[PDB]
Amino acid sequence: AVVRFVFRGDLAELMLRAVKDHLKKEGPHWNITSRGNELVVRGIHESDAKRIQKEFPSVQSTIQAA
């Protein structure tokens, strides 16, 4: 699956960086990339994808199960 986080406002870059550092610790094996205000996690299990969405529930996110 794929999770995409979209960060908003004047702090978006710093919040992305915070979330990115956190997720690199949760899943050192996850393929994590970012550009602009979007953070993308690939190679994550669909159930783990709903978990990290639920961990940062106020960050807008999408999940692609395919």
Residue numbers in the entry: 0 to 65
The publication says:
The RGD (Arg-Gly-Asp)-binding integrins αvβ6 and αvβ8 are clinically validated cancer and fibrosis targets of considerable therapeutic importance. The highly homologous integrins αvβ6 and αvβ8 bind to latent transforming growth factor-β1 and β3 (L-TGF-β1 and L-TGF-β3) leading to release of active TGF-β1 and -β31–3. Here, we describe a method for computationally designing hyperstable RGD-containing miniproteins that are highly selective for a single RGD integrin heterodimer and conformational state, and use this strategy to design inhibitors of αvβ6 and αvβ8 with high selectivity. We found small α/β ferredoxin folds were able to scaffold the RGDLXX(L/I) binding loop without clashing with the integrin while making additional contacts with both α and β subunit (α- and β-loop respectively).
Affinity maturation identified a substitution to a lysine (A39K) making a salt-bridge interaction with E316 of the β6 subunit while the LXX(L/I) motif remained fixed confirming the importance of this motif for selectivity towards αvβ6. In B6_BP, the β-loop is positioned to confer selectivity between the two integrins, where residue K39 faces E316 on the β6 subunit and K304 on β8. B6_BP binds αvβ6 with a higher affinity than αvβ8 on the surface of K562 cells, with a Kd of 0.11 (±0.09) and 580 (±40) nM, respectively. As intended, B6_BP is more selective for αvβ6 than B6B8_BP. B6B8_BP and B6_BP do not cross-react with RGD-binding integrins αvβ1, αvβ3, αvβ5, α5β1, α8β1, and αiibβ3 at concentrations up to 200 nM in cell surface binding experiments using K562 cells stably transfected with different RGD-binding integrins, corresponding to >1000-fold selectivity. As B6_BP binds to A431 cells with higher affinity and is more selective than B6B8_BP for αvβ6, we selected B6_BP for further in vivo experiments. AF680-B6_BP rapidly accumulated in the αvβ6 positive tumors and reached a high tumor-to-muscle fluorescence contrast ratio within 3 h post-injection.
